[PDB]
Amino acid sequence: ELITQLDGFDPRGNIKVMFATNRPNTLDPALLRPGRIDRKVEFSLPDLEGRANIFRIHSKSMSVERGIRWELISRLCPNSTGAELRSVCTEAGMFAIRARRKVATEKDFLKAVDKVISGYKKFSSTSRYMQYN
Amino acid sequence: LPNEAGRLEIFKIHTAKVKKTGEFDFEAAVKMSDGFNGADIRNCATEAGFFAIRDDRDHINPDDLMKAVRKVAEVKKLEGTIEYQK
Amino acid sequence: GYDRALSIFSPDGHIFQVEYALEAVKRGTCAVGVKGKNCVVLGCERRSTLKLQDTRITPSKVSKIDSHVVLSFSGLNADSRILIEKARVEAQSHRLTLEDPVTVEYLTRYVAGVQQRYTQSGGVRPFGVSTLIAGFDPRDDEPKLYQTEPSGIYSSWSAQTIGRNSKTVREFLEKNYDRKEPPATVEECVKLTVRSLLEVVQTGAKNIEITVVKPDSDIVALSSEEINQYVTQIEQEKQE
Amino acid sequence: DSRVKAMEVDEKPTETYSDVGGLDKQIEELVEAIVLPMKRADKFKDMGIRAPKG
Amino acid sequence: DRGVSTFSPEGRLFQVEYSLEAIKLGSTAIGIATKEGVVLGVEKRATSPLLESDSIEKIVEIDRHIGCAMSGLTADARSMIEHARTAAVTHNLYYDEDINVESLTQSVCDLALRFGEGASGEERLMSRPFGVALLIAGHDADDGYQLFHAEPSGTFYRYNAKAIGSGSEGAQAELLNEWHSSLTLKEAELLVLKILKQVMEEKLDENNAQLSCITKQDGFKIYDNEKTAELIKELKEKEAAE
Amino acid sequence: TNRVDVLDPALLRSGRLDRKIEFPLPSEDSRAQILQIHSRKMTTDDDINWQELARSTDEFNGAQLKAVTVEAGMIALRNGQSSVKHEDFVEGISEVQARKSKSVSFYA
Amino acid sequence: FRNNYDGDTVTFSPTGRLFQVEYALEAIKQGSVTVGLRSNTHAVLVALKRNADELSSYQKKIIKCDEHMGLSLAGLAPDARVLSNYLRQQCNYSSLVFNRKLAVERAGHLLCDKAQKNTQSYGGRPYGVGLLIIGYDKSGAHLLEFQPSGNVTELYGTAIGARSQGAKTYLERTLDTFIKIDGNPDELIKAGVEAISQSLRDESLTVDNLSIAIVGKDTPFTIYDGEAVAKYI
Amino acid sequence: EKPDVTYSDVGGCKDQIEKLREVVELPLLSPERFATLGIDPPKGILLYGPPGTGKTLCARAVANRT
Amino acid sequence: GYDRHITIFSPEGRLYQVEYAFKATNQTNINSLAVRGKDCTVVISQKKVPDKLLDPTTVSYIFCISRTIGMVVNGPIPDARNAALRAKAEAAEFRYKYGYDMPCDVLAKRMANLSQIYTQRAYMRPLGVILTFVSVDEELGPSIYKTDPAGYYVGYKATATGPKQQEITTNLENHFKKSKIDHINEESWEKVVEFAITHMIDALGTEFSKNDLEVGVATKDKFFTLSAENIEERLVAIAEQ
Amino acid sequence: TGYDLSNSVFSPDGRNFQVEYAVKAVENGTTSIGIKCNDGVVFAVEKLITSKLLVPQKNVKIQVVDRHIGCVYSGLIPDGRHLVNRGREEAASFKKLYKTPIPIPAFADRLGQYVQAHTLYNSVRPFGVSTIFGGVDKNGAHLYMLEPSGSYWGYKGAATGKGRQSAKAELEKLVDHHPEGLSAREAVKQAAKIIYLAHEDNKEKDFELEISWCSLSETNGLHKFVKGDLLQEAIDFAQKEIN
Ligand SMILES: Nc1ncnc2c1ncn2[C@@H]1O[C@H](COP(=O)(O)OP(=O)(O)OP(=O)(O)O)[C@@H](O)[C@H]1O
Ligand SMILES: Nc1ncnc2c1ncn2[C@@H]1O[C@H](COP(=O)(O)OP(=O)(O)OP(=O)(O)O)[C@@H](O)[C@H]1O
Ligand SMILES: [Mg+2]
């Protein structure tokens, strides 16, 4: 029924349609071709420079010292989604609250990167789902 | 499905009604026609009649019948597999 | 033939059969290596949960490759024997054709090279074993202590530990082992390796095995009595 | 039913066969099967054949 | 499940493409080629203080006139380096002359693709390609000093200076500004040690960094730790001169 | 319908759906005719040689060919040009293709 | 977006096509452009090479196969490095046994049948490279186009690679001028450089980026490079 | 009722943000520019990628803007 | 899923894939009948030539394996030629290694065993033909053995195969019910053919021209198929009765 | 469901889907006919001229086998060029062992087994080609057509490719008017007439006609190409009638 109102037997009104899936594999060839899904745009893992800008967008609320070299810990973080980077900053703030320190330091951010990637490289959603792509 | 014997009676019922230039090729057509249902023979005379509209003829030549048989058969077999009875 | 490509890269850039192999080495019993001034000491965990098990005839965790190279291991007990057979073979082959016993670094390079091979051969699963290869080169008294792993890379260490609870043992060795000054003698070193183990074994004199290897082809296994004595001393020393 | 009445022809915008690109033999064969038996219905009746149904 | 030969809808072999990301996870190798020699610099990257850092090896001699640096999963490179010494040695046995660098590199690239599922008697000696990339440096009389980057892609380019490893992106940004044809052998050493410090994740000292050169006169030489300590002290000076 | 193998035989067969008309992909020459009736609506130039573009597109549907025309104007708009040029029709064929990595000098 | 018939080469699709052979044909549309054209006395290859970045050098594109036959690749380098090695050996196998310069036409078929036997069988990546094979034998000048499907054809001129279409258009017009230029090797190279300038997406020809090769009634197969192609830009 | 997760929060200055804006935002904002050429604007976008890459994050960002 | 593509048992306990082969047999619409004479064997089968273009001579279902053994095939013709070529090789090889002619039984038993290996290996697919071998063996007299893709075979007093085999079975049974002997009795081989065609006209209802039949007869030490002229003589003998 | 993915599997019906699919790949090729004359055979194939760069009369799609068996195919052009190549071994090998040129019903049998073998394992793709091949030996002329399934039959005219409808309908009228068995010298001019008629559903991209014949009485039973004048006369004959 959905396919048939995106080509109608008539011009349909001003209607833009956005599809968001975790697998294009599943989708039927009738949904995919232009006129019903004109532009495919891939949101992929950010490269190294991406991971530098996404650290800046979570951290700007945070209190951090001046000597944080975000280039240093982006280089140390392997290929990662933007969802791991949220958990990184949360855990950096977490070790500072356990330690009784109001400001997050360089030691605390390294520990957090270590904890997130080490344990959860066992539970990475990224590896299975990248293959359906 | 009509047997090789009957299949011959069915042809003669749908080519009598329609105009023709006198058609003696039903001896060939029956032999070409396998797995034809009653329904496909009746459609076969129609396709033969539609080549008669393109040529501007007003009779079904025995040449137009040879073409029609082949045309119904190619598409039939391909696109639908008819049931196996018990 | 049977040659399926069991081991392939994932899009993250790690081989998943090799990460799985290394998790298998974690559940293994614990083996520790520390090299003193002029000895090595290999301490190993005996699973003592078992009762009515004869210790006289039961294969140990320290298997001599040559008369001056010993090997210890963590991981799958069954697969371990497969490395030790190819190693005993390689030690006599090298004696045959070049003369001179194997140097510890060469015997590792062979053993480490086998674990690497089985990560490319189609049809073969990787090994589930990490080893500590220790001993003295012939006509020398520098102790040498190496570690291989199922990636195939090998490295020398001043002290090391593989197997379960290894982070807790390694933390104790980073505080109690001065890199400049080894345990003064052979007797102090044994007292450093036992004291590290008693943190994760939660005692049991029978649980701990100690094999000491000394220069000039002197391999001896410390007996139960000796081990007990050491434990009682350390417990009494630490207790005091 | 009221849905049938909404389905009737409200006039589909003039495409013309010139704005169906290519596809010549397909157009011919459709208009043979659908168009003619409506308008040229006398030439099929004299020939004797029934009219293609769909 | 995909085979190992399969192409993507773009026309790229999956495994060979995935393999390139294994190189990104490796440690940093820097290579600057001058008209007096080539300098090879590596971050050893010890993983503990107990780990003895001298036994780690990432620079290896192929022949007195060819040296090699490794980045990626480095146990795979045990197999590549063994092939290379044979080709280089077997080739000096048949023709009484040292291989060219450009010819030696190509023989290791042919070897690289060999993955498959097996068909007839034909060897396929991997399941996935060598998960390591190499910087082959060396010198022949014909074309002076050369420096090559051989990737598991199966293609090699001759470079004036390339840097691969964890800090590849930020390292090659600094080279593009700093290199020119008029560097000498003692300026390149300090130029590798300056770039090695910007992408390094530790403190720069003599134990966990290694330098190597290749000159015609002396062959391929790995610097001892003593010489490297002097060059590390000599970097701190030129940055305080300013 | 676009799946004809699935429908059972009582819905097909002569005497119900007498004619069974197949639609082939636009052939290399038809692509030229197709691109030319969709472009009349937007601005054109004589720069464009539609003959070129028709040879490039292989196994393009009459729906994707209409996409090429639309996409090409999107790139003309992003530059800010008066009208569509030949570069943008070429550039547009690559946008309809799901290509998204180009040549990272993966290919010699 | 990845189909269901993308597994091994054995699989046919319900449309009838073989998808894995079509995927290997995309490996050509991402390589660098290369233009071949011939008269009745000279064949000419004009390839635009490709650097990786600035510090990098350029990637060879034209392989001397013998002294009267040479080919230029566009696509994967190691796939060509197997197919160019194979033609070398088959050209020696003719001079040794039959003392016959291997006719260009016969070398096309030999290559074709070597590509076919890897898309019939399970396992075996199909070769992801497109070659142009020029050469001069006893029947004159010849220029072949070899697809990774295996189909080899004889042409007066072609191109392959990225944005080849702009050059292939210039060859369809001027085909009637450059085909009659015989006994003059200079002008035939000039017509080939002009062709490949139509395909550039503003990369700009340069003396280190261009590579030309000719072969003729009297010349051996020779490749021009660096300073030697400064006269021809 | 249109939540607000502003457009700054989307990572970087990616091309991916700019390809969404040409589909949704521009034909509503400025139909002056599309009228001259005569192009009718695209309609469908397909966002696809491994989990955690911000497919949803952008959706919320265009929800208020639009 | 992968228990019904290859030949392993299903959870129920049946080799699905083999079972699917028998439905592949009746995909040509040939019917056959085969009876034991008193000193000969006769086998008739319909021969439908579809198009005018086909040359009527090459279309055939009766294959000469040896002088001793004829073979009539029911099923798709690629697998026909594949089973007939393998049969001929075994017929020759037997003669070579044991020094007499291959009996009918021994050729039948060699095919059932190759058929078995094909339902037990995974990568092999069972051939979709049913083979019937007629002969006049020298030890046992007239014989018919019918082999099938599963690899089961048995002797027969008479047999039929095809889409309308059920009709033809009822007649062949009704005859041995009344006479109470195992085989049609009439010394001459000419009159066993006349009887044969009578039961096909009944069982199928179809009247047969001389082209619609193809007749094979095994006597002592030669097996032939009858020429198109000879099948016309037979049909004049039915009309004159 | 999963019965279409693989070869040499049967569906519950009793069909090999890979083999049904291969006939759709034959269906895309160019029109190709074969006329059995009284004295021999005439093969004729429409060869599309794709562009002004393809060189004229130089891409023969008629391959000879031995000295007296013409092979012309439609479908996947490399895949046909392999099935003939294997067929040059089977012929040269028979000729070695029995020192007589291989007879045509026997050559049809060798090819048959080879194509039939490639529908028996998961490991090999079925051939995507229809062949028409024939010639003249000491028992007369024969003509065969090899389906990608592995069946073959005798024929008096055959067709394959896109124009198989119009051709097979035209070869019926050619066997009607001439029931005696038309002459070989005349059948060159009749084969031309069947390509130009079957090229009206394809009149978009012009073509170049190739004809070859093998007759006992004209060329001594050796397969040649028609070339020069008799071919330039054939084009004229067919072209004048269909005006
Ligand atoms: N042959 C053609 N010539 C011109 N335009 C075409 C052609 N084919 C398709 N188009 C364009 O593609 C658009 C979409 O086509 P359409 O909706 O008919 O697809 P469809 O074949 O009906 O798909 P479905 O499988 O859903 O039925 C049309 O509005 C038309 O503008
Ligand atoms: N590009 C990005 N920039 C900044 N933050 C991001 C980015 N991508 C993800 N995040 C963070 O990760 C969180 C989860 O992302 P989101 O809910 O968009 O997942 P998704 O992309 O829809 O994947 P899934 O739907 O599989 O969970 C967001 O709430 C946000 O905090
Ligand atoms: Mg989401």
User: Among D12, D17, D20, D24, which is best to mutate for testing ligand 1, by the most ligand atoms less than 8 A from CB?
Assistant: D20
Number of folded domains that form chain C: 1
Which residues have a Cβ under 8 Å from the Cβ of D34 and sit 6 or more positions away? D52
Count each helix (H run) and each strand (E run) in chain C, helices first.
6, 10
Is residue D22 in contact with ligand 1, taking CB distance under 6 Å?
yes
Q: Rounded to the nearest 5 degrees, what angle is found at the Cα of J44, between the Cα atoms of J39 and J46?
A: 170
Asked whether residue H52 is marked as a ligand-binding residue, the answer is yes
Considering all CA atoms of chain D, what is the largest pairwise distance in Å, rounded to the nearest integer? 40
I10 alpha carbon to ligand 1 midpoint, in Å? Answer: 46
**Which partners does chain G have (≥3 C-beta pairs < 8 Å)?**
A, E, F, J
Q: Is H38 annotated as a binding residue?
A: no
- Inter-residue long-range contacts of I117-120, CB under 8 Å, 24+ positions, other chains counted: I118/I149, I118/I151, I119/I7, I119/I15, I119/I17, I119/I18, I119/I149, I119/I150, I119/I151, I120/I7
- How far apart CA C145 and CA C69 sit, in angstroms, is 10
Q: Are E163 and E31 in contact (CB under 8 A)?
A: yes
Does F55 lie at the interface with G, CB-CB under 8 angstroms? yes
Which residues of chain C lie closer than 8 angstroms to A131, CB-CB? 10-11
Q: Which of residues 119 through 138 in chain G touch J, CB cutoff 8 A?
A: 119-122
Task: Give φ, ψ of J196 to 5 degrees.
Answer: -70, -30
Name the nearest CA neighbour of J111 among J71, J75, J62: J71
What is the A90 CA–ligand 2 centroid distance (Å)? Answer: 14
Structure tokens at G157: 């001129």
Ligand 2 contact via H6 beta carbon (within 6 Å):
no
* Cβ–Cβ under 8 Å, residues J74 and J30: yes
Phi and psi, residue G138, nearest 5°: -85, -20
Give the count of domains, chain J.
Answer: 1
What's the resolution in A?
A: 4.1
Residues near F46 by beta carbon (within 8 Å), at least 6 away in sequence: none
Instruction: Name F107's Cβ contacts closer than 8 Å, sequence gap at least 6.
Output: G27, G30, G31, G32, G74, G75, G76, G77
Structure token pair of residue I186: 């009439």
Residues with CB under 5 A from ligand 3 (ion): H 55-56
- Whether the CB-CB separation of G8 and J5 falls below 8 Å is answered with no
What's the CATH code of the domain at C122?
3.60.20.10
* Number of the ligand closest to the Cα of A82: 2
H36 labeled part of a ligand binding site:
no
Experimental method: cryo-EM
Using DSSP's 3-state secondary structure scheme, residue H46 falls into strand
Q: In this structure, are residues C157 and C33 in contact, taking their beta carbons and an 8 Å threshold?
A: yes
Q: How many residues does chain I have?
A: 241
Partner residue opposite B34 with nearest CB, options I29, I52, I212: I29
Continuous H helices in G130-220:
165-173, 175-178, 185-197
Amino acid at C88: R
Our measurement of the distance from residue H49's CA atom to the centroid of its chain's CA atoms, rounded to an integer in Å, reads 16
DSSP H helices, J136-183, are: 164-177
Name residue, tokens 């210039």.
G170
Question: Rounded to a whole number, what is the largest CA-CA distance in chain J?
Answer: 57
Residues C47/C163, Cβ–Cβ less than 8 Å = no
Provide the 8-state DSSP code for D50.
P
Q: What's the domain range around J217?
A: 1-243
Closest residue of chain F to J205, computed from CA coordinates: F29
Neighbours of I56 (CB within 10 A): 13
**In angstroms, what separates the C-alpha of G173 from chain F's closest C-alpha?**
12
Query: How far apart are alpha carbons A126 and H52 in whole angstroms?
Result: 8
Identity of the amino acid at E218: D
d(CA J201, CA J205): 10
Cα(I97)–Cα(I112) distance, integer angstroms: 20
Q: Give the residue carrying structure tokens 């967008």.
A: A57
Q: Which of residues 57-116 of J touch G (CB under 8 A)?
A: 58-59, 77-79, 81-82, 85
Q: Yes or no: is domain E1-242 CATH 3.60.20.10?
A: yes
Cα A10 from Cα F2, distance rounded (Å) = 19
Q: How far is the CA of A49 from the centre of ligand 3 (A)?
A: 23
3-state secondary structure of E7: strand
Domain ranges, residue C235: 1-240
Judged by a CB distance cut-off of 8 A, whether residue F28 touches chain D is no
C140: amino acid identity, one letter = D
Residue A21, classed as helix, strand or coil, is strand
Per-residue b or e along J99-115, where b marks 16 or more CB atoms closer than 10 Å to that residue's CB: eebbbbeebbbbbbebb
Residue J119 sits in a domain whose CATH number is 3.60.20.10
Asked if J41 contacts J156 with a C-beta cutoff of 8 angstroms, the reply is: no
HSE toward the beta carbon, residue G117, CA cutoff 13 A = 9
Annotated domain spans of chain E: 1-242
Q: Rounded distance, CA C73 to CA C51, Å?
A: 23
Q: Quick one: E123 exposed, middle or buried, by C-beta within 10 A (0-12, 13-18, 19+)?
A: exposed
Structure tokens at G115: 């590509």
J30 is catalytic: yes
* Contact by Cβ (8 Å): E100, E140: yes
SS3 content of chain G, % helix, strand, coil (to 5): 30, 25, 45
Give the CATH number of domain I1-241.
3.60.20.10
Domain ranges of chain I: 1-241
DSSP state of C102: P
Question: Which of C107, I17, F63, G194 minimizes the C-alpha distance to A7?
Answer: F63
Residue located via tokens 């593509």: I5
Tokens 């498959």 locate to E116
I217 backbone φψ class: left, alpha, beta (φ>0; ψ -120 to 50): beta
- CA–CA distance, E29 with E192 (Å, rounded to integer): 10
**J32-36: strand order across its sheet:** J157-160, J32-36, J40-48, J207-215, J224-225
Q: At what angle do helices B62-79 and J164-177 cross, to 10 degrees?
A: 140
Contact B70, B39 (CB under 8 A): no
H50 closest CB neighbour out of A50, A54, A130? A130
The residues that bridge with G136 in the sheet, in sequence order, are G141
The correct CATH number of G3-233 out of 3.60.20.10, 3.40.710.10, 2.70.180.20, 3.40.50.920 is 3.60.20.10
Kindly state the DSSP code that residue A98 receives in the 8-state scheme: H
Query: Given an 8 Å threshold on Cβ–Cβ distance, is D49 in contact with B58?
Result: no
Rounded-to-integer distance, Cα J98 and Cα B25, Å: 47
For F41, the 3-state DSSP assignment is coil
Determine the length of chain H: 66
Q: Work out which ligand 1 atom sits closest to the CA atom of F2.
A: 25
Closest listed residue to residue A22, CA positions, set A100, A69, A85, A83: A83
Q: Is H6 annotated as a binding residue?
A: no
Q: For residue C209, what are its two tokens?
A: 């095995």
Confirm or reject contact between J13 and chain B (CB < 8 A).
yes
